[PDB]
Amino acid sequence: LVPVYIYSPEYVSMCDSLAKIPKRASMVHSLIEAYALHKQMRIVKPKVASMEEMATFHTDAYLQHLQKVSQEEYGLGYDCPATEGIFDYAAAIGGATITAAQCLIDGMCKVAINWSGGWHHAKKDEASGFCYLNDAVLGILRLRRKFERILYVDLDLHHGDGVEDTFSFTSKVMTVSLHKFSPGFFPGTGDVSDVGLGKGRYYSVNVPIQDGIQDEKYYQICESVLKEVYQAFNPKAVVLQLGADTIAGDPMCSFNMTPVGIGKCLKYILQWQLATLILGGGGYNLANTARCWTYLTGVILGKTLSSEIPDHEFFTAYGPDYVLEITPSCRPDRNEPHRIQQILNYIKGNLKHV
């Protein structure tokens, strides 16, 4: 009944070294610790993923290449620099999510959290969008050993293309992604008409959304889709990716959400009372990402947190207001109601086939 919190000092330090988000893992953990939330959770040390565990998804040629560049193509480049920490980072993140999955299998908990996971872009032999290894896929494949139908819900700002593509030809894993979809915006995929292929047709769900969406409309959309998905797909377990790059104040400056709105989505999923693997993802206003995942941990624990950020290691990063709540930016919501309705009707039509 007590949620599992994947953590070790070594893991945080490892994750802290991803050059795109320096120290973010420490900031998230430190704030969670400052609110004393870890004492209400079962703290589980993550294992490091073995080569064989990583090879359940990634090809050996790809994994050997990561090993090679870590010691001395494949999507390595501007977004995914080939640096020496690559292989150990992959094994650690993957291992953490696999550990969370295993805890859920063993019935240790109903909810297991790896805030440093959620790297949804990576494919079997291609790095993409800061993702060297797809830990979300790894967790789904582990859960698959016990659970017959798995629902993957992706609330990151970006389309969960790596996870959806991996399971596009299957009906045993359904992917649902809400994301910004606009020509030029990474990764450029995930229109409402993308529904999966072959036996998996209608088992991929995409909700293309525009800039400026706020809490109430987002939840209305998310609740509407998830309601139909639940009744049509009847999932036995859930993997939930909660990238905080949708949150107001993110330098990506696209959606205009607060952790409260995401929390309502989280609450809706939690009341299904299924085994649920919780993952992080994007989130580039580092203090806000910590504010968000701290609040969401509170939501998982059913606790209401004090508005004042406690003094702690990174306290100075929480200016100018030093509170946990995030105020939406004063800019317009570019989502026109009729288009949103069209999308919801298209999805509903798709789910009748499921």
Ligand SMILES: CN(C)c1ccc(C(=O)NCCCCCCC(=O)NO)cc1
């Ligand atoms: C300021 N600067 C130098 C850059 C800013 C943005 C990108 C970018 O979005 N690149 C495309 C890859 C986006 C990765 C998004 C990862 C994510 O949050 N996935 O959910 C690149 C450079």
Ligand SMILES: [K+]
């Ligand atoms: K998403």
Ligand SMILES: [K+]
């Ligand atoms: K699928």
Ligand SMILES: [Zn+2]
């Ligand atoms: Zn993202």
